[PDB]
């Protein structure tokens, strides 16, 4: 027997203590080595309630990533409400590694194993583990990258699907590659992301089919973001230490969801590498040096989408726009099937 509880978790990883890459450096002093022989125990005839939207594991991962970024990223200038801080800004080595979250003595992590678990409610196939799977702390907007996939069908997660102020997380059951490139020696800031259009459109069509299930059978329409900082109106992410902003207008394209010529084939998103950014920690503006020379390339798996639904009474259609900005939702997309309980 056990009871729901919060406690201080610790992280474990396979970080290399000799690496200079910044995630490895953080995890080397902040986490312990991974457990060589992890044990999972399935609990028979146990039914338990999970709630991904109120799960303190998320706040704890958030604290860790914030502190990882605070000590790893080296902007030439930070501007915070009035104070200007100038410093050296050498280029860094940057590539996320998986982090595991682990309970101390007296506590265990319960894990939901129902294939189509949506994040809240009863789980019938429960097991207990000492540590989560390895989660890459990938910071991105609009598209969730390098995450885990849903086991069976595409899943829609929300605290309240009818609350337009609540983010919606779409969990894909098949990854779509996005291949981003700032080519070697035009403008050095200009880059592009390539996506298999044939594959992306099929997946988006399946997402609409699933979204329809939650709103009667209304027409489902995608539109570009209505406004906001570039970090959220564009697909934003860091590759090799550079800050990429990619225009996703072509990705959320409704005609391609019949056979109009040119839906299939490669989709090329225009991107920019920005030196001046708003910090996702939320501490103001930062400025970095121009990009490193040569080919800058990031091939990632799209494993989820963040959506916001338009408000206002509408009986005909529902409109969804790519969203994000609250980086905690990124962690929720991976921690949704875990909860900490205290052993009695």
């Amino acid at each position: 027997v056990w009871k729901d509880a919060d406690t201080t978790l610790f992280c474990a990883s396979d970080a290399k203590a000799h690496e200079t890459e910044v995630h490895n450096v953080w995890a080397t002093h902040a986490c312990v080595p991974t457990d060589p022989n992890p044990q999972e125990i399935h609990l028979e005839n146990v039914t338990e309630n999970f709630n991904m939207w109120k799960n303190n594991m998320v706040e704890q991962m958030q604290e860790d990533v914030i502190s990882l970024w605070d000590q790893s990223l080296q902007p030439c200038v930070k501007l915070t409400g009035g104070s200007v801080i100038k410093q050296a800004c050498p280029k860094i080595s940057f590539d996320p590694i998986p982090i595991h979250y682990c309970t101390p003595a007296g506590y265990v992590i319960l894990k939901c194993n129902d294939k189509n678990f949506n994040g809240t409610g009863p789980c019938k196939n429960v097991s207990s583990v000492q540590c989560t799977h390895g989660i890459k702390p990938v910071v991105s907007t609009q598209l969730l990258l390098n995450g885990s996939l849903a086991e069976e069908e595409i899943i829609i997660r929300t605290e309240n699907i009818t609350d337009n102020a609540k983010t919606i997380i779409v969990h894909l059951n098949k990854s779509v590659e996005i291949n981003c490139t700032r080519p070697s020696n035009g403008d050095i800031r200009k880059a592009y992301c390539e996506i298999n259009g044939t594959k992306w459109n099929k997946v988006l069509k399946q997402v609409t089919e699933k979204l329809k299930e939650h709103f009667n059978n209304k027409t489902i329409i995608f539109q570009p973001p209505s406004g906001g900082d570039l970090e959220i109106t564009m697909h934003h992410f860091n590759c090799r230490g550079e800050f990429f902003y990619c225009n996703t207008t072509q990705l959320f394209n409704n005609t391609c969801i019949e056979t109009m010529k040119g839906c299939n084939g490669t989709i090329t998103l225009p991107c920019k590498i920005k030196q001046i950014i708003n910090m996702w920690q939320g501490t103001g503006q930062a400025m970095y040096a121009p990009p490193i020379d040569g080919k800058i390339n990031c091939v990632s798996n799209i494993t989820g989408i963040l959506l916001t639904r338009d408000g206002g009474e509408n009986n005909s259609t529902e409109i969804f726009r790519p969203g994000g900005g609250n980086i905690k939702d990124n962690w929720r997309s991976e921690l949704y099937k875990y909860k900490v309980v205290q052993i009695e």
Partner: protein, 222 residues
């Protein structure tokens, strides 16, 4: 439960635009969104939009057709609601609202701005004509007043005897005339015996047109 501070009343021609501002914090850590609503004369509250001050994310009621834009200043202390291509039925009191910080629902509006009247009309600024409503020569208590006619925009303030006479005074809500101009009446009941001895003056003040009137209201002589 502090009040938020909105900008002042605005008047606009159809087709123009207006920007309402809403100060919601001092310039001295999860943040609830700033919401904007409006309420038309004798109508139910209508939700327009929310705006996340951390990154400027927004959500607009679909039927506003992109005529509405919400932003915030760099310090994230003030939100702005811009409404373009105004029509007369945009005429309303506009509010900003916000959930209390410790609450976990975006929609329980604990904090409200004082409201910003927005009037959309093709009418031009005009001060009122002020006519007497004479005490009838038909004698306990008699009634008299001032008709404040044909002004735009609202509001007008009305005193009696330079604000000295407050008891028995009823100043009625203005009414919009088909001409596009407003009118209101202010009345006072007083002892009839007083009519012969007491001077009654209604002081009307129409700031927008910089118009002031002290109308003496007397019994009409035959």
């Amino acid at each position: 439960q502090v009040q938020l501070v909105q900008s002042g009343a605005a008047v606009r021609k159809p087709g123009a635009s207006v920007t309402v501002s809403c100060k919601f914090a001092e310039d001295d850590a999860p943040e609830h969104f700033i919401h904007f609503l409006r309420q038309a004369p004798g109508q139910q509250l209508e939700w327009l939009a929310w705006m996340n001050p951390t990154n400027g994310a927004v959500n607009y009621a679909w039927y506003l057709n992109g005529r509405v834009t919400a932003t915030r200043d760099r310090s994230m202390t003030t939100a702005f609601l811009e409404v373009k291509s105004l029509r007369s039925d945009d005429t309303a009191v506009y509010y900003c609202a916000r959930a209390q910080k410790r609450g976990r629902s975006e929609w329980a509006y604990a904090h409200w701005g004082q409201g910003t009247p927005v009037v959309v009309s093709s009418a031009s600024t005009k001060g009122p004509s002020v006519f007497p409503l004479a005490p009838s020569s038909k004698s306990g208590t008699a009634a008299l007043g001032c008709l404040v006619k044909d002004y735009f925009p609202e509001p007008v303030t009305v005193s009696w005897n330079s604000g000295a006479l407050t008891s028995g005074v009823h100043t009625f809500p203005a009414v919009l005339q088909s001409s596009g101009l407003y009118s209101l009446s202010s009345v006072v009941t007083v002892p009839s015996s007083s009519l012969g001895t007491q001077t009654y003056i209604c002081n009307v003040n129409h700031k927008p047109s910089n118009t002031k009137v002290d109308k003496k209201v007397e019994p009409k002589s035959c």
